[PDB]
A paper describes a structure:
The three largest gene segments of the Thogotoviruses, THOV, DHOV and JOSV are homologous to those of IAV and code for the heterotrimeric polymerase. In this paper we present the atomic structures of the putative PB2 cap binding and 627 domains of THOV and the putative PA N-terminal endonuclease domains of THOV and DHOV. Despite very low sequence homologies, all domains have similar folds to those of the corresponding IAV polymerase domains. However, the critical active site residues in the putative cap binding and endonuclease domains are not conserved in THOV and DHOV and, contrary to the case of IAV polymerase, neither domain shows the expected in vitro biochemical activity.
The corresponding construct (residues 1 to 169) was cloned, expressed, purified and crystallized. The structure could not be solved by molecular replacement using that of IAV PA-Nter due to low sequence homology. THOV PA-Nter comprises four principle β-strands surrounded by six α-helices. Comparison of the two independent molecules in the asymmetric unit of crystal form 1 shows that the region 72–89, including helix α3 and the following loop, is in two very distinct orientations. In chain A, this element is positioned as in DHOV and IAV (see below) whereas in chain B it is dissociated from the body of the protein, rotated by 90° and inserted between two neighbouring molecules in the crystal. For THOV and DHOV PA-Nter the putative active site is more like an extended groove and furthermore, is positively charged. The extra positive charge in the putative active sites of THOV and DHOV PA-Nter arises from the replacement of acidic residues and the introduction of extra lysines (Lys38, Lys61 and Lys97 for THOV and Lys39 and Lys100 for DHOV PA-Nter). Surprisingly, for the THOV domain, addition of Mn2+ or Mg2+ ions destabilises the protein by 3–6°C. Interestingly, the significant difference in thermal stability behaviour of the THOV and DHOV domains correlates with the enhanced plasticity and much poorer diffracting crystals of THOV PA-Nter.
Numbering used by the authors:
A (entry chain B): 2 to 47, 55 to 90, 92 to 166
B (entry chain A): 3 to 50, 53 to 165
């Protein structure tokens, strides 16, 4: 119930307070999957992109409190291109049977194999896809090693 | 109860966007808005490889509010544009008209992208879009126009424009 090898220490520690995991069914898997998404965000943005996913806002929320204007919106994209374009990272079962979740938060969909959707592949450079496909290959190894295939597929659905 | 040429996602998304039961020809209007939404999607299959267009139509208001803050732009919830060019920084509304000839801005807030029932683009609209995008729209609207005649709901569509 602790962290896997392929997940960075930085990412796992960062993921703890972002969501109440024990509350959720397959809470540990759910946490690991979100850590995949966040890692892909880092890989894509390693600057063109700001990674909004799991960003510290407490200082911002604090300033809004003192001026009573408006707290920052919860519904944030995972990352934002400064083209002025927002993106959300998805993990899917079928690139084929895929439809866009938002026309504003554009989807960057991937297989568990690490295969990008057609639009997603255009955005990325080959350098970035190889890291993501390389990273998600390590992830899937851990998935089968713990026989957690069904839990992950369900969590994707 | 969806027509075939309309995608299942588009049809599911369209249900709650407007109270269709309330309207005179509510079913037709639901499908007509689905054309507009599809045309928005067809237009937004264009990349710079970043997406050229954001499609504001039938989006969660929280999402619209967020980017508009980031793009330093703003529209009334009544008249919000259907899509926004991210390169040119110009907002658009998809119109379906019978006559392209005499057309001039519907709104001073956004530029209009008008199309026929045949699938022919207006002059200003054609200047903005690429041929790639028009053939998709003209191809899709031929599928639509066939479905209209196949079910003989032709006049009902013409009036409500």
């Amino acid at each position: 119930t602790d962290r896997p090898d392929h997940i960075d220490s930085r990412v796992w520690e960062l993921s703890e307070t972002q969501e109440d995991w024990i509350t959720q069914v397959h809470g540990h898997v759910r946490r690991v999957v979100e850590c995949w998404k966040y890692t892909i965000c880092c890989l894509i943005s390693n600057p063109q992109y700001d990674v909004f996913k799991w960003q510290d806002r407490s200082t911002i929320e604090w300033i809004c409190s003192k001026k009573k204007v408006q707290y920052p919106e919860r519904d944030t994209p995972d990352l934002y291109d400064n083209r002025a374009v927002a993106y959300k990272v998805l993990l899917v079962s079928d690139l084929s049977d895929h439809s866009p979740t938002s026309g504003i938060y554009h989807d960057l969909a991937f297989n568990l194999e690490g295969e990008a959707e057609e639009s997603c592949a255009l955005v990325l450079r080959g350098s970035q896809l190889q890291d993501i496909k390389g990273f998600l290959c390590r992830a899937l190894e851990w998935v089968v090693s713990n026989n957690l295939t069904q839990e992950v597929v369900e969590t994707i659905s």
